[PDB]
Amino acid sequence: ADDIVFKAKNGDVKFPHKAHQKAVPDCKKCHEKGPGKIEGFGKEMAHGKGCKGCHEEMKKGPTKCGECHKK
Numbered sequence: 001a002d003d004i005v006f007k008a009k010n011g012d013v014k015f016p017h018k019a020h021q022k023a024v025p026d027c028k029k030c031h032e033k034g035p036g037k038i039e040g041f042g043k044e045m046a047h048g049k050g051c052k053g054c055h056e057e058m059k060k061g062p063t064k065c066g067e068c069h070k071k
């Protein structure tokens with residue numbers, strides 16, 4: 001429900017929105033241009049300092065391609 005699925009050509013990439021809404025405070029970290037869609041998203045950030053960035057740093061979360069890219 002509140003969750004969000006991102007159709008991927010290598011397996012859907014589940015992303016706990018509501019969950020990340022309880023784990024992370026400031027949303028500007030994800031919604032720099034205010035809450036909404038992120039025109040430009042993709043492997044780009046999803047890989048760089050997008051998701052893996054706020055993951056590896058703490059060493060927690062889908063850091064492998066078998067975690068994000070894996071229906």
Ligand code: HEM
Pocket residue numbers: 006007008009010013042043046047051052062063064065067068069
């Ligand atoms: C070295 C491991 C990884 C490889 C080789 C990899 C490869 C790719 C590739 C090739 C794409 C482009 C798909 C396309 O648009 O045709 C992509 C997109 C994406 N990746 Fe990764 N990825 C890896 C790990 C991750 C991880 C760990 C996450 C989640 C934290 C992630 C999240 C995404 C998302 C959300 C997209 C955009 C949706 C899509 O177009 O599939 N990736 N990745």
Ligand code: HEM
Pocket residue numbers: 017020021024025026027029030031035036037038039041
């Ligand atoms: C004030 C807190 C937040 C609000 C109000 C919010 C709201 C939204 C809304 C409304 C959408 C989709 C637009 C729509 O359907 O109307 C969205 C998408 C999204 N949100 Fe959040 N969100 C918040 C926190 C977060 C956080 C903390 C992250 C990252 C940890 C995040 C990551 C995303 C991503 C990746 C998308 C998908 C957009 C895309 O496909 O490019 N959100 N958010």
Ligand code: HEM
Pocket residue numbers: 013014015016019020023024029030046050051052054055058060061062
């Ligand atoms: C669209 C980008 C992102 C995606 C796809 C993503 C995906 C995920 C997923 C699938 C988990 C597994 C946790 C679970 O639900 O059990 C996770 C965990 C986590 N993510 Fe993210 N994430 C993203 C962005 C971020 C950002 C920006 C931050 C920091 C601002 C962040 C911080 C964390 C932390 C700290 C955890 C560990 C869970 C815990 O608190 O135990 N993530 N992430």
